[PDB]
């Protein structure tokens, strides 16, 4: 293409989308998801029993970087797992579901639109 790189057009929207989630913008719902969950300072001693596959955002866009995912879906289903995995572990009325919820809404949206 006469500007861009190689990877699909699909990628390209994935790229978007998690640059986006990285934004200002969202930062006062998005800032829980942006590390690896930090189960020593949180003293959460049941993380790792409870949920299998940790995942955020900062892995998700190493992933990217190094063209891991193959197409959006696989993009899609880390950022779900992501989610699903703090709906899973955290009190149903943790402040931080609802920040998921709503970072999950920008996402959800966003992805909606993928080029096909």
Same mark, same amino acid.
């Given at each position: 293409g006469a500007m861009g790189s190689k990877i699909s057009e699909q990628l390209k929207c994935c790229s978007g989308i998690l640059k986006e989630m990285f934004a200002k913008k969202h930062a006062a719902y998005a800032w829980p998801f942006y590390k690896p969950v930090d189960v020593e300072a949180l003293g959460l001693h049941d993380y790792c029993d409870?949920?299998?596959?940790?995942?955020?955002?900062?892995?998700? *866009?190493?992933?990217?970087?190094?063209? #891991?995912?193959?197409?959006?879906?696989?993009?899609?289903? !880390? @950022?779900?797992? %992501?989610?699903?995995?703090?709906? *899973?572990?955290?009190?149903?009325?943790? #402040?931080?579901?609802?920040?998921?919820?709503?970072?999950? !809404? @920008?996402?959800? %949206?966003?992805?909606?639109?993928?080029?096909?």
């Open positions: 409870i949920i299998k596959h940790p995942m955020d955002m900062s892995t998700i *866009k190493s992933k990217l970087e190094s063209r #891991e995912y193959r197409d959006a879906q696989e993009f899609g289903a !880390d @950022v779900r797992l %992501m989610f699903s995995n703090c709906y *899973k572990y955290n009190p149903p009325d943790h #402040e931080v579901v609802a920040m998921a919820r709503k970072l999950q !809404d @920008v996402f959800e %949206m966003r992805f909606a639109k993928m080029p096909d």
